Amino acid sequence: KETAAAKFERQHMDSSTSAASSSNYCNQMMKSRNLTKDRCKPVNTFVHESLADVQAVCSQKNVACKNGQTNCYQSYSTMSITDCRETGSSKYPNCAYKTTQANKHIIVACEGNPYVPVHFDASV
Numbered sequence: 001k002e003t004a005a006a007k008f009e010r011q012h013m014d015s016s017t018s019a020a021s022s023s024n025y026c027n028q029m030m031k032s033r034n035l036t037k038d039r040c041k042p043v044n045t046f047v048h049e050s051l052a053d054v055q056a057v058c059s060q061k062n063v064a065c066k067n068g069q070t071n072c073y074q075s076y077s078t079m080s081i082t083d084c085r086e087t088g089s090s091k092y093p094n095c096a097y098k099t100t101q102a103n104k105h106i107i108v109a110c111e112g113n114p115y116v117p118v119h120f121d122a123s124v
């Protein structure tokens with residue numbers, strides 16, 4: 001069974017590229033990480049930093065989560081990320097995405113022992 005920590009890694013980690021992420025990136029990545037299986041997931045962010053660096057965000061700047069919970073943390077440094085957002089003409093099962101690379105602070109929710117990222121909240 002997939003732990004919440006594992007699901008965060010599958011959905012949100014891509015340390016293998018620094019972000020040279022082509023226009024193709026989101027179409028390929030959303031599919032291979034199984035985010036287009038039951039529907040087209042509308043919005044999803046991939047972080048291009050080490051797992052150690054992203055996990056360390058759980059000990060960084062504590063900020064309110066969008067849902068009002070208090071277990072969110074914003075990175076002190078900007079990180080290389082790619083936002084994937086569904087196009088208007090995207091129709092399941094042919095999920096289509098706009099790929100946008102940026103350098104931004106990430107906000108993640110953390111839980112558990114060890115205290116690790118389990119949700120991607122936002123980038124700022």
Ligand SMILES: Cc1cn([C@@H]2C[C@@H](O)[C@H](CN3CCCC3)O2)c(=O)[nH]c1=O
Nearest residue numbers: 012043044045046083119120121122123
């Ligand atoms: C704003 C933003 C949201 N997401 C997320 C991942 C997943 O937690 C979220 C789905 N939310 C669930 C309720 C509202 C939307 O899209 C991202 O992956 N990147 C973002 O920049």
